[PDB]
Amino acid sequence: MVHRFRQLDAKLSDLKGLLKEISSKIK
Protein backbone atom coordinates (compact mmCIF):
# COMPACT_ATOMS: atom_id res chain seq x y z
CA MET A 1 0.00 0.00 0.00
CA VAL A 2 2.98 2.33 0.40
CA HIS A 3 3.01 2.44 -3.41
CA ARG A 4 -0.62 3.53 -3.23
CA PHE A 5 -0.71 5.97 -0.35
CA ARG A 6 2.14 7.59 -2.30
CA GLN A 7 -0.63 8.65 -4.68
CA LEU A 8 -2.54 10.45 -1.92
CA ASP A 9 0.13 13.03 -1.06
CA ALA A 10 0.03 14.47 -4.58
CA LYS A 11 -3.60 15.55 -4.16
CA LEU A 12 -2.81 17.23 -0.84
CA SER A 13 0.18 19.04 -2.35
CA ASP A 14 -1.89 20.28 -5.29
CA LEU A 15 -4.67 21.42 -2.95
CA LYS A 16 -2.16 23.30 -0.79
CA GLY A 17 -0.72 24.98 -3.87
CA LEU A 18 -4.17 26.05 -5.04
CA LEU A 19 -4.99 27.29 -1.53
CA LYS A 20 -1.85 29.43 -1.51
CA GLU A 21 -2.66 30.74 -4.99
CA ILE A 22 -6.19 31.75 -3.98
CA SER A 23 -4.85 33.33 -0.79
CA SER A 24 -2.53 35.42 -2.95
CA LYS A 25 -5.50 36.27 -5.17
CA ILE A 26 -7.58 37.69 -2.32
CA LYS A 27 -4.53 39.45 -0.85
Residue 14, number of CB atoms within 10 A of its CB: 10
Could you say which residues in the range 1-27 bind its own copies, by CB under 8 A? 1-2, 4-5, 8-9, 11-12, 14-16, 18-20, 22-23, 25-27
CB of 16 to its own copies, least distance (A): 6
Residue 16: which of 5, 24, 4 has the closest Cα?
24
Largest CA distance in the chain: 40
Interface contacts to its own copies, rule CB under 8 A: 1-2, 4-5, 8-9, 11-12, 14-16, 18-20, 22-23, 25-27
